[PDB]
Coordinates of C-alpha atoms in Angstrom, one line a residue:
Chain B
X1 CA 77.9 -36.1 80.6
X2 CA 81.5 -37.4 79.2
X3 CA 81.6 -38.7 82.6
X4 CA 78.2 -41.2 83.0
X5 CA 79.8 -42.9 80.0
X6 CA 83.5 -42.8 81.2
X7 CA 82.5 -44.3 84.6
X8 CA 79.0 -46.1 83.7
X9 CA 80.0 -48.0 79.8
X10 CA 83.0 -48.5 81.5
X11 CA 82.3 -50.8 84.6
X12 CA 79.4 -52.4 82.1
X13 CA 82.1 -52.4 79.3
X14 CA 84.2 -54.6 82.2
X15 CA 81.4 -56.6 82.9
X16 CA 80.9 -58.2 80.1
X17 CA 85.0 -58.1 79.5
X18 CA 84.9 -61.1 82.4
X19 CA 82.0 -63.1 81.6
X20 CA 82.4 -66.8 80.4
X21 CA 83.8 -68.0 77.0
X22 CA 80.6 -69.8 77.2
X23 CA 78.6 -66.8 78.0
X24 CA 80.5 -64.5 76.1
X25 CA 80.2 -66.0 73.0
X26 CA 75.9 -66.4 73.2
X27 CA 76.4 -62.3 73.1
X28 CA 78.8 -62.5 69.9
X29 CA 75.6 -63.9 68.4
X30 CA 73.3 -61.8 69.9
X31 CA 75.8 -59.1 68.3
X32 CA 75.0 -60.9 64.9
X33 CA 71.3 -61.4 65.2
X34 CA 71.2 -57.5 65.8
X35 CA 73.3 -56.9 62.2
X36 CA 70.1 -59.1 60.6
X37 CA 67.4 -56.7 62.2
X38 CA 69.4 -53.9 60.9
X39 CA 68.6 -55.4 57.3
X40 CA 65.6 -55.6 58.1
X41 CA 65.0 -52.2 59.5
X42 CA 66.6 -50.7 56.5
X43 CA 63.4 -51.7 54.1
X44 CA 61.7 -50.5 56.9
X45 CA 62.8 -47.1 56.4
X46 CA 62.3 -47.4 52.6
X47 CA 58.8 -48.5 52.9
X48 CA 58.6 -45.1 55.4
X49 CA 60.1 -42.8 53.3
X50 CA 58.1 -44.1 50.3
X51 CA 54.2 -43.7 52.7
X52 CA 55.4 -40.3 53.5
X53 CA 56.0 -39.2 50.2
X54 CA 52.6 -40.9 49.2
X55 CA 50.8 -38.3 51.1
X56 CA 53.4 -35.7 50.3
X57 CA 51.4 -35.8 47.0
X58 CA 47.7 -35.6 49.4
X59 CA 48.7 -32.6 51.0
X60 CA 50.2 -30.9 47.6
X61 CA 46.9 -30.0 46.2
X62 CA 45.8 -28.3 49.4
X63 CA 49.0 -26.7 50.2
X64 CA 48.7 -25.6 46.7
X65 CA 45.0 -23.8 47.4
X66 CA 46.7 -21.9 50.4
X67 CA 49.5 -20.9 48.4
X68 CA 47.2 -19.2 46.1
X69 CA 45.2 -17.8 48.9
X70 CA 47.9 -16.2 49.7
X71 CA 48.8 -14.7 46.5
X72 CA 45.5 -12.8 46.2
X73 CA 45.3 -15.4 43.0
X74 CA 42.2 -17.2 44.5
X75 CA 39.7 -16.3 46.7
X76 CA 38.3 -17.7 50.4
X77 CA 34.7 -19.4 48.9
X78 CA 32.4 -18.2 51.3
X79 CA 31.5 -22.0 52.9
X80 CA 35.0 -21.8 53.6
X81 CA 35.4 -18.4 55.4
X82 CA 32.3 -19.4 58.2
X83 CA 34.5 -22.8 59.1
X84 CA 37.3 -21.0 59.7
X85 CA 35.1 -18.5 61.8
X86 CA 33.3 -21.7 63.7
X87 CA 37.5 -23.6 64.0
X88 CA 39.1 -20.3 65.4
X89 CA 36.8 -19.6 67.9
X90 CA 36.5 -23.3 68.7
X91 CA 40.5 -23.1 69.3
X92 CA 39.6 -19.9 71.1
X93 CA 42.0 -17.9 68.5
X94 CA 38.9 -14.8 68.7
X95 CA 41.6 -12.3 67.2
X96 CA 41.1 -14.0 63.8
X97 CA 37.0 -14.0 64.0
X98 CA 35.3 -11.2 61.8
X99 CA 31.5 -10.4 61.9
X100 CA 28.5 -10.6 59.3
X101 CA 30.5 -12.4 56.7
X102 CA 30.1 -11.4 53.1
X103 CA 41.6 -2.7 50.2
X104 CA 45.0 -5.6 49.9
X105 CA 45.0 -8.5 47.4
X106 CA 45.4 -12.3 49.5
X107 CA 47.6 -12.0 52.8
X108 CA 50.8 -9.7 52.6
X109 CA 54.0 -10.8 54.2
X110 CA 52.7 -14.1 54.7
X111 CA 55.8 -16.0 54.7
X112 CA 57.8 -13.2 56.4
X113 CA 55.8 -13.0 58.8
X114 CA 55.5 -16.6 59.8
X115 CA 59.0 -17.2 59.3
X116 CA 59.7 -14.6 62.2
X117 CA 57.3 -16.1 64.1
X118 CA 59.8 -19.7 63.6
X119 CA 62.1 -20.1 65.6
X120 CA 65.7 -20.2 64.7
X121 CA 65.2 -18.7 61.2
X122 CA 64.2 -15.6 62.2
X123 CA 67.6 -14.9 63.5
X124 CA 68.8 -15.2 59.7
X125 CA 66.5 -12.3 58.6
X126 CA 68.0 -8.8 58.3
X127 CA 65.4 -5.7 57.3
X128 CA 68.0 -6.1 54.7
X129 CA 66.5 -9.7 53.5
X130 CA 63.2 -9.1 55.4
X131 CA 62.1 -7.0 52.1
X132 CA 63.4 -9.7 49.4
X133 CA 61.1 -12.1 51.9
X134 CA 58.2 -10.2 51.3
X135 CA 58.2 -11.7 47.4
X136 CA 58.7 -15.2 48.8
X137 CA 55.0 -16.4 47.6
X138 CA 55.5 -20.3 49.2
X139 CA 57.5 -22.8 50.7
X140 CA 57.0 -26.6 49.9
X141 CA 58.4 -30.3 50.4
X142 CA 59.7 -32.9 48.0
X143 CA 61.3 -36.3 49.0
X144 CA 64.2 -37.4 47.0
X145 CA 62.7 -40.6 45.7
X146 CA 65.2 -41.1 42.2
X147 CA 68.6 -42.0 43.6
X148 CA 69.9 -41.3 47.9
X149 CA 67.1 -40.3 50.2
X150 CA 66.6 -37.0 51.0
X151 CA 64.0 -34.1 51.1
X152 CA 64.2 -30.0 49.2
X153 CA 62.5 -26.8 49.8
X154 CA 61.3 -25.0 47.3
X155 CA 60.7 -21.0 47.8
X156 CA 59.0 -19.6 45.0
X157 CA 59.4 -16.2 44.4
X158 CA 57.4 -13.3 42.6
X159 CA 60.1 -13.4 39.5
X160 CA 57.4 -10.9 38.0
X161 CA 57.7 -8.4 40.5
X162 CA 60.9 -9.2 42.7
X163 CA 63.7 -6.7 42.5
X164 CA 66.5 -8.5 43.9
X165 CA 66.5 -11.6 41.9
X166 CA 65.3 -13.0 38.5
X167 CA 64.8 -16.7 40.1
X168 CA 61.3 -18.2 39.9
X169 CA 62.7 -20.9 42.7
X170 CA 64.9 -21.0 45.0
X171 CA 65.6 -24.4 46.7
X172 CA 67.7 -26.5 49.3
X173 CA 68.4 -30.4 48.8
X174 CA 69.2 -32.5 52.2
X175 CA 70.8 -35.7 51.4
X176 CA 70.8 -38.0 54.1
X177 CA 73.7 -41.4 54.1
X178 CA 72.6 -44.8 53.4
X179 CA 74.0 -46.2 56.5
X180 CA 71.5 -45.5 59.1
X181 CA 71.8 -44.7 62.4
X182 CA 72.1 -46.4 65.4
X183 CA 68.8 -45.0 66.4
X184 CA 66.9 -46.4 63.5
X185 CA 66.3 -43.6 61.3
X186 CA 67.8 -41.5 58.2
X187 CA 70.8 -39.2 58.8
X188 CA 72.1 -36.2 58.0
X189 CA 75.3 -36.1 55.2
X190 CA 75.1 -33.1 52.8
X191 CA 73.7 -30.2 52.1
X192 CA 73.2 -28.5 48.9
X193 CA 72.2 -24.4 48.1
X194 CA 70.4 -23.8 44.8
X195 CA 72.0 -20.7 43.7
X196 CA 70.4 -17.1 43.1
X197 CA 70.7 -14.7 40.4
X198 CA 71.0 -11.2 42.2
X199 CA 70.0 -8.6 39.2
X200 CA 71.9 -5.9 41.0
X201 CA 75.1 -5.9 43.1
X202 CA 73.4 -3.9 45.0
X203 CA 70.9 -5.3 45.5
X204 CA 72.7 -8.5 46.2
X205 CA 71.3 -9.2 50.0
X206 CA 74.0 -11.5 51.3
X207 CA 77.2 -8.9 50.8
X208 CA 77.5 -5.1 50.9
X209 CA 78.6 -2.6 48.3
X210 CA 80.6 -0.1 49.6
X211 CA 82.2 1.4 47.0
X212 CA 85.4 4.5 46.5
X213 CA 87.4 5.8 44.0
X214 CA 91.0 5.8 43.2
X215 CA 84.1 4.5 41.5
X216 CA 84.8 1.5 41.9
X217 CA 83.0 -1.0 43.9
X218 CA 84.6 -3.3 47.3
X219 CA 82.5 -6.2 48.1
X220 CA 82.1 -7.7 51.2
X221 CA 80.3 -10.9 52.9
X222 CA 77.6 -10.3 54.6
X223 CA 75.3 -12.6 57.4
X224 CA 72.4 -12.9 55.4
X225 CA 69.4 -15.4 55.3
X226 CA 69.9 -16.0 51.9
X227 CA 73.7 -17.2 52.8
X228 CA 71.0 -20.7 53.3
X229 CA 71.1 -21.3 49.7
X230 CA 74.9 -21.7 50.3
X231 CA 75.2 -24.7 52.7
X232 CA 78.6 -24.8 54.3
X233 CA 81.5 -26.5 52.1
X234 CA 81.5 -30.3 51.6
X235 CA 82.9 -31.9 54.9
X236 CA 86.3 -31.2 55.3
X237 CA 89.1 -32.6 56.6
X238 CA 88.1 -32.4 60.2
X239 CA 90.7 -33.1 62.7
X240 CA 91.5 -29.7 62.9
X241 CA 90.4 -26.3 65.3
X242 CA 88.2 -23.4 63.9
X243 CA 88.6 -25.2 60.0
X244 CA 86.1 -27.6 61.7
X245 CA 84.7 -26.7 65.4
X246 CA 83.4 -23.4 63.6
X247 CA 82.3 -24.7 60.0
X248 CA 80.7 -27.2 61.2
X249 CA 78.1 -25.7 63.6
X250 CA 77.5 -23.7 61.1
X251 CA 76.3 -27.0 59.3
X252 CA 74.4 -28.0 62.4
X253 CA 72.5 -25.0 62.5
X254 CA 71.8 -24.9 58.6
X255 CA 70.6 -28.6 58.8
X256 CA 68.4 -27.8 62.1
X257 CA 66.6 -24.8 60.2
X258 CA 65.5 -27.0 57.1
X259 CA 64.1 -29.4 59.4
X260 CA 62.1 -26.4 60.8
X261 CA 60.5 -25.6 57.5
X262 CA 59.9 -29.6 56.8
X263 CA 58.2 -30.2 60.3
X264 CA 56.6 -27.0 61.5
X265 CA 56.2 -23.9 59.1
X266 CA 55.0 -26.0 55.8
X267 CA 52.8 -28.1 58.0
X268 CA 51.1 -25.4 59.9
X269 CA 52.2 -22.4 58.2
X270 CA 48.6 -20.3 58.7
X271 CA 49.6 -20.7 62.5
X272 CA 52.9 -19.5 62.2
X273 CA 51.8 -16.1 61.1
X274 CA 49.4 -16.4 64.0
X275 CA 52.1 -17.2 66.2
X276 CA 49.2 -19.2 67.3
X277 CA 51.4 -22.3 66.8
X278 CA 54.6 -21.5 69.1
X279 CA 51.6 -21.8 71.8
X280 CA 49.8 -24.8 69.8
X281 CA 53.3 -26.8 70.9
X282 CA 53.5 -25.8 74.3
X283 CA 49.9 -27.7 74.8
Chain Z
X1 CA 59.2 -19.7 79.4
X2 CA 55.7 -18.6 80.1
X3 CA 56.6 -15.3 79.0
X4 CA 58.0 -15.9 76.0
X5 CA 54.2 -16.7 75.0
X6 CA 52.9 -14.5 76.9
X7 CA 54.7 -11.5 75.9
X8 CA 55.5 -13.2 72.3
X9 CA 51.8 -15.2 71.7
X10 CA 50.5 -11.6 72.3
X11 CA 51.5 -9.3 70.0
X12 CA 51.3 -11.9 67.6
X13 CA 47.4 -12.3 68.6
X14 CA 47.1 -8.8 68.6
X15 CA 49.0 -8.3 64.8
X16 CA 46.8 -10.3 63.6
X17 CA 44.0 -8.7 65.8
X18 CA 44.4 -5.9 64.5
X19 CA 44.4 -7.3 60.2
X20 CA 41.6 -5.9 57.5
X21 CA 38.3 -7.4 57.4
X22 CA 39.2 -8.6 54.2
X23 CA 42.9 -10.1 55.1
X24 CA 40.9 -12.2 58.1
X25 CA 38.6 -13.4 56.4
X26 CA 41.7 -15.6 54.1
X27 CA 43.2 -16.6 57.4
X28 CA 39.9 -18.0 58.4
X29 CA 39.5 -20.3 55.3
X30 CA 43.4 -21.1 55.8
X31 CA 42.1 -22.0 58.8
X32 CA 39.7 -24.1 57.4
X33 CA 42.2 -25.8 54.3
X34 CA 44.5 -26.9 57.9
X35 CA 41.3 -28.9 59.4
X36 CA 41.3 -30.7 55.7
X37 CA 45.1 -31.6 56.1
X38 CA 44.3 -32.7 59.6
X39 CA 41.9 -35.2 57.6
X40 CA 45.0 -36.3 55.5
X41 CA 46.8 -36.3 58.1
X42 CA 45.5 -39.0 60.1
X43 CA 44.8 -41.4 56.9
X44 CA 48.7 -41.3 57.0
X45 CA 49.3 -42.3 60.7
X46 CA 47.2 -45.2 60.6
X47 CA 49.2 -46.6 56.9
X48 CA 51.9 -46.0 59.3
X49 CA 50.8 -47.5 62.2
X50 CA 50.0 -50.2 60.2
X51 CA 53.3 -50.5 58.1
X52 CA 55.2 -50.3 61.4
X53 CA 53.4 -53.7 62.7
X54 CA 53.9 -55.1 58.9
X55 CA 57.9 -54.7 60.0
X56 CA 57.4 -56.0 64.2
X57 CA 56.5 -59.2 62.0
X58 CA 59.3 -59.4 60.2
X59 CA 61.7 -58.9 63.4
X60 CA 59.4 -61.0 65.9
X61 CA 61.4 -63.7 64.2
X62 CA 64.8 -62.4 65.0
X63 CA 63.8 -61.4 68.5
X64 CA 62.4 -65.2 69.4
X65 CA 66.3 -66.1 68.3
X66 CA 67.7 -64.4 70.9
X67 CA 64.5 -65.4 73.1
X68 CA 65.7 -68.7 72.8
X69 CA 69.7 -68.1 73.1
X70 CA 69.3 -66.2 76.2
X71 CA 66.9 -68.7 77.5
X72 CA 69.6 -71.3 76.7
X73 CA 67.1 -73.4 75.0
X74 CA 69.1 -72.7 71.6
X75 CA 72.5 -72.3 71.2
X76 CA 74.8 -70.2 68.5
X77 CA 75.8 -71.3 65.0
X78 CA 79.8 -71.2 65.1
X79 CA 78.7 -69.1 62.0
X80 CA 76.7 -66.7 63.7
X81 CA 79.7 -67.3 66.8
X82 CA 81.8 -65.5 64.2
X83 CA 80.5 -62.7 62.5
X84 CA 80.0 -61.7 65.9
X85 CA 83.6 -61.0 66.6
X86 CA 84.2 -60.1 63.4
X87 CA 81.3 -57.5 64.1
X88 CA 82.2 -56.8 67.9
X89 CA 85.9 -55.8 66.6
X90 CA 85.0 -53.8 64.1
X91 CA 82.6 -51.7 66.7
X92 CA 85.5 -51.9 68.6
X93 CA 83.5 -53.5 71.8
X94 CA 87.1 -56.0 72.3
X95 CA 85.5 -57.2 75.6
X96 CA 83.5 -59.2 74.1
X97 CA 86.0 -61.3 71.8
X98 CA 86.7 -64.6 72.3
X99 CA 89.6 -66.6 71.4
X100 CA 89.5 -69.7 69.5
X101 CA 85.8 -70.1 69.3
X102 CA 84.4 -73.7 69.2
X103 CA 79.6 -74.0 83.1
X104 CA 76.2 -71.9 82.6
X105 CA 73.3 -72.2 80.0
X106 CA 72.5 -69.5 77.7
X107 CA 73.0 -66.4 79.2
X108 CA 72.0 -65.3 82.9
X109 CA 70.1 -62.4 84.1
X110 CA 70.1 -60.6 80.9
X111 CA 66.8 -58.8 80.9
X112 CA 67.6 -57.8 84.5
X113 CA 71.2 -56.5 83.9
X114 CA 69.8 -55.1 80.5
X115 CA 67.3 -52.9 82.6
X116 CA 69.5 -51.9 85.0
X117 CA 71.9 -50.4 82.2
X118 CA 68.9 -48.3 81.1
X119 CA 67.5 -45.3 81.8
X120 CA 64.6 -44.4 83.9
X121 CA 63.7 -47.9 84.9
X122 CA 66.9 -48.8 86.6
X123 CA 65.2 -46.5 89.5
X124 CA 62.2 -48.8 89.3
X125 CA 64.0 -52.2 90.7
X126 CA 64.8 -52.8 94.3
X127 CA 66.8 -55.6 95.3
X128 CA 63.9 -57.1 96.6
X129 CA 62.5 -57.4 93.1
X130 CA 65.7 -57.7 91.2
X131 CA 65.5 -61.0 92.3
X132 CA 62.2 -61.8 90.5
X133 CA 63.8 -60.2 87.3
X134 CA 66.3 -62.5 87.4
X135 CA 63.2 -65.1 85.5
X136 CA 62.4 -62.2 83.2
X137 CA 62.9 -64.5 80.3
X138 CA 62.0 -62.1 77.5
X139 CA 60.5 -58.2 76.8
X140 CA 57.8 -58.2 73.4
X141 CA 55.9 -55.6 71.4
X142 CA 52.5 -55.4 70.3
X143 CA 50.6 -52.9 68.5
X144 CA 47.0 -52.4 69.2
X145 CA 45.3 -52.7 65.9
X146 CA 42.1 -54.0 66.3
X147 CA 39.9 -51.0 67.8
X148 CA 41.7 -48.0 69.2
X149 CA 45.5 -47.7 68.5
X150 CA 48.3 -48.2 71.1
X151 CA 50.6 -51.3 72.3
X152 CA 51.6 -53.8 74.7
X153 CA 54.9 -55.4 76.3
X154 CA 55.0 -58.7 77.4
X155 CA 57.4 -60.2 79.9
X156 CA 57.6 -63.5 79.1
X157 CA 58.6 -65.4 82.5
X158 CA 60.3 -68.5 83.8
X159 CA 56.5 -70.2 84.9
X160 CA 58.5 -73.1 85.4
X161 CA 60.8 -71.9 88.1
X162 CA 59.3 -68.3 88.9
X163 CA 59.4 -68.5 93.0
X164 CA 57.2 -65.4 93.0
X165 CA 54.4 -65.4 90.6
X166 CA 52.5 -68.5 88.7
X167 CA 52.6 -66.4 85.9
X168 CA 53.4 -66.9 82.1
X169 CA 53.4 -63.3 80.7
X170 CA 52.8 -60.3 82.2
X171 CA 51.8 -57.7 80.0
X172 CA 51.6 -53.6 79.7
X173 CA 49.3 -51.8 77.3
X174 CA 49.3 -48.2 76.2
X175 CA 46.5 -46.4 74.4
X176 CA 46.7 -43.4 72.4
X177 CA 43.7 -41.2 71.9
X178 CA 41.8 -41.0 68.8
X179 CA 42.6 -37.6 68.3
X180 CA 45.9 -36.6 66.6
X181 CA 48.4 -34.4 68.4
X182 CA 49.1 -30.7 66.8
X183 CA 52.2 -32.0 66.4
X184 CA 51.0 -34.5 64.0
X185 CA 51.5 -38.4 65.9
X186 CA 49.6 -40.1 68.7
X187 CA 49.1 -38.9 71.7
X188 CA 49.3 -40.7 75.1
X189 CA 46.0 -41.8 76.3
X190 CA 45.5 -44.4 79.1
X191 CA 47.6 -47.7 80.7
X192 CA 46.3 -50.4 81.0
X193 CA 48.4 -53.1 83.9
X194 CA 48.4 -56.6 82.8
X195 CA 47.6 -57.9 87.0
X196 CA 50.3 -60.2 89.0
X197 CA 49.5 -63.6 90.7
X198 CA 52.2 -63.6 93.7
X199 CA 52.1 -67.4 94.8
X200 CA 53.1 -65.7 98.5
X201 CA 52.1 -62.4 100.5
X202 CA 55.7 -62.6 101.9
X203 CA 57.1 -63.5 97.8
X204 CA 54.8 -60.4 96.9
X205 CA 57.7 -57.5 96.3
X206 CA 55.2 -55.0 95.8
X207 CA 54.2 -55.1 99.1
X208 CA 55.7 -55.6 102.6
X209 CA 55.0 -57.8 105.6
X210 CA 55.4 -57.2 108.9
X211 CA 54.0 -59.9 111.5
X212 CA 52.5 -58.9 114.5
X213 CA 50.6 -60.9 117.2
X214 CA 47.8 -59.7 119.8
X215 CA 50.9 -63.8 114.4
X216 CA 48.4 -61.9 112.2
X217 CA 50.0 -60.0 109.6
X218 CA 50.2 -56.4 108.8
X219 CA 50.6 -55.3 104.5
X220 CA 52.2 -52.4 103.3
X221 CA 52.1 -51.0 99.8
X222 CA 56.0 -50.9 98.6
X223 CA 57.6 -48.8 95.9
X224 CA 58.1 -51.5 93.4
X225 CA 59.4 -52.3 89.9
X226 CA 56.6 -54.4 89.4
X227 CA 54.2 -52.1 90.3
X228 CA 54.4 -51.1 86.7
X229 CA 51.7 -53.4 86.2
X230 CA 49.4 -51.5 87.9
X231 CA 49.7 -48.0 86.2
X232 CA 47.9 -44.7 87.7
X233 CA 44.8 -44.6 88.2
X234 CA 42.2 -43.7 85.0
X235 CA 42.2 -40.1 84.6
X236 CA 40.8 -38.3 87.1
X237 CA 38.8 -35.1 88.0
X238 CA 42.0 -33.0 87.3
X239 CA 41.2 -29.3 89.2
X240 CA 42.7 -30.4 92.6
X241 CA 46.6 -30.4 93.8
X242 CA 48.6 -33.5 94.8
X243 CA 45.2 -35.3 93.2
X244 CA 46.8 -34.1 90.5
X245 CA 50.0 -32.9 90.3
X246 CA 51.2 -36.1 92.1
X247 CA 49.7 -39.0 90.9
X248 CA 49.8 -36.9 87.3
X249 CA 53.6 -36.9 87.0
X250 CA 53.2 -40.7 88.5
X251 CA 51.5 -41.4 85.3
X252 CA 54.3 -39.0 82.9
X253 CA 57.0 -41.4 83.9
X254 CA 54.7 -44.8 83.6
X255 CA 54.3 -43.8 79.6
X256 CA 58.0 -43.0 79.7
X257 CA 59.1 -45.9 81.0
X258 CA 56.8 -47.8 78.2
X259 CA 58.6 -45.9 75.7
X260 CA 62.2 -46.6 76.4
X261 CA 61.3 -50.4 76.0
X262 CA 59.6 -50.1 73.5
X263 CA 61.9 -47.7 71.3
X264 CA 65.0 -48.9 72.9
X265 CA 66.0 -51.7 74.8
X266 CA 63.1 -54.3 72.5
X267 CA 65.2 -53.3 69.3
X268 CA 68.7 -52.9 70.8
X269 CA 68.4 -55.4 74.1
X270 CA 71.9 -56.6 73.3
X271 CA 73.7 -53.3 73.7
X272 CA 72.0 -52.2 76.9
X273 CA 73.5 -55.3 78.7
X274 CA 76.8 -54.7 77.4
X275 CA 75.9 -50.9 78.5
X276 CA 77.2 -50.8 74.6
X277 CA 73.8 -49.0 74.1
X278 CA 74.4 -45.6 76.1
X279 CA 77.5 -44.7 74.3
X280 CA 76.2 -45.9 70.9
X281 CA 73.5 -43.1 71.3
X282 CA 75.6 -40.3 72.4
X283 CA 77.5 -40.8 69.6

């Protein structure tokens, strides 16, 4: 409240400015047994990061079934397709329950779909992108172990059947600083955007072609939610007004999204689609 | 918003309402692969669990340190002394320098001036009890992991010179439920208050006494601090309104009170009597 901290840290701020030499100095201490627990909380953190990407490799293999699922590549085994009947209607989710168990291949628009469903990414999609989205055949995790902490995303595409770019992946790398915070946990440094290889200019999603004659073409810039795999420039020198106010919530906004694929779409993605999840969180 | 699920959580339930027999039926065995995950899932929180009390070990260590410096029964290394100006300056905390480094021992009401600093359960202590957190000689963590997960705080006390209560520790302990959240972590389950043996009716601060004669006296159930260690009643027969509602929310703030301890004034006590601690999170 720029005001509970003006008023409030600075009585307690004058407090502890007049306390005893004696008394004072027992906190200068206290100040240094706090820099050792840091240390300490540091391996912490390493030891963390390392469980989580232990399972990151558990959760692979069936991530992996859905992704195929999805692709129409492999189908629901029939044991399979009564649990789910049995699970939906025991979450009460009767929209998705279908009669005498045993047209489209897998699940179309899967991860369109469930990315509309997210929230703040689906303020990125444009009809424009929405129809490049519909070859987007997964989205999954990876923990930068080799080197600075970190995670990626990795969006693979149909490269055999998608008309806007050749790319077989498309990723985004979030590499967090080795100091930590004050909180206790990783944070947020840089960002970077694995570039894509637009056959067409045309059919390039994140400008617009409008061309004249003099048949030459004019590009021009456009908001697109492919502009992700084009994190904003490496900080900059900041003191300044728009050159840092503006491209830097951009930043915020960019780092917030990836953190929405990492916590909530990869990890529930079936209820995303659903939209069975935006209510899942709310309980 | 209510509506924003009811509106939104509809026509997503209906979408997918209204999918082919054959696109259902992959849902429902997507369904099925998220209950397997789920499995996974919970394999991971308990290595967690488990890893997190491998580290409370290593900083238990640390933590009796400043036990024992605030308790004045140890006193500060001229080394230690020093890095803690060098350490204060550099976080720019100058109030707490002291000139040429080497009345009171150790350091006086710091759990009670720590508390006060910190959020929600500043609200909890009266005067009348602020005075009985002046022996509140240290604040511990414990995590539950023989049976069903959770934790515990102990409040360590002066025994030796507590006026009020006899006692040596008074504890708090929080149990999650077996069952995972959707979100993925523990969920809140039941508290548990670690009882108080006042050595006086009139020293209980939890109550009030009023004399009368007809010198008989007359006890009144106070809004305490210490009433902490007598959380809300065991879950009751929900339905009803202020049976619920009321002593419901009572409950809401007990477990986030528990929390705050627990996540921030055990691992950053220091800062939250120098008030240090507010700022240090905003920023």
């Amino acid at each position: 409240i720029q005001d509970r901290l003006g008023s409030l840290v600075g009585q307690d701020s004058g407090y502890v400015g007049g306390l005893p030499k004696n008394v004072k100095e027992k906190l200068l201490s206290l100040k240094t047994l706090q820099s050792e627990l840091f240390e300490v909380e540091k391996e912490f953190q390493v030891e963390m990061f390392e469980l989580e990407n232990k399972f990151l490799q558990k959760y692979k293999p069936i991530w992996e079934q859905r992704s195929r699922i999805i692709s129409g590549q492999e189908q629901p085994k029939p044991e399979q397709i009564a649990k789910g009947q049995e699970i939906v209607e025991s979450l009460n989710e009767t929209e998705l329950l279908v009669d005498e168990e045993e047209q489209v291949k897998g699940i179309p628009s899967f991860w369109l779909t469930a990315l509309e469903n997210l929230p703040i990414v689906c303020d990125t999609i444009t009809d424009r992108d929405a129809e490049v989205l519909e070859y987007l055949q997964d989205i999954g995790l990876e923990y930068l172990t080799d080197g600075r902490p970190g995670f990626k995303l990795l969006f693979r595409f149909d490269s055999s059947a998608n008309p806007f770019f050749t790319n077989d992946i498309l990723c985004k790398t979030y590499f967090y600083q080795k100091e930590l915070g004050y909180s206790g946990d990783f944070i947020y440094d840089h960002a970077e955007g694995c570039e894509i290889s637009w056959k067409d200019n045309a059919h390039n999603v994140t400008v617009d072609l409008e061309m004249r004659k003099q048949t030459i073409e004019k590009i021009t810039p456009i908001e697109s939610f492919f502009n992700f795999f084009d994190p904003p420039k490496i900080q900059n020198e900041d003191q300044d007004e728009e050159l840092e106010e503006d491209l830097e919530e951009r930043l915020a906004l960019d780092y917030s999204i990836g953190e929405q694929l990492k916590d909530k779409l990869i990890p529930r993605a079936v209820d995303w689609f659903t939209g069975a999840a935006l209510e899942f969180e709310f309980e």
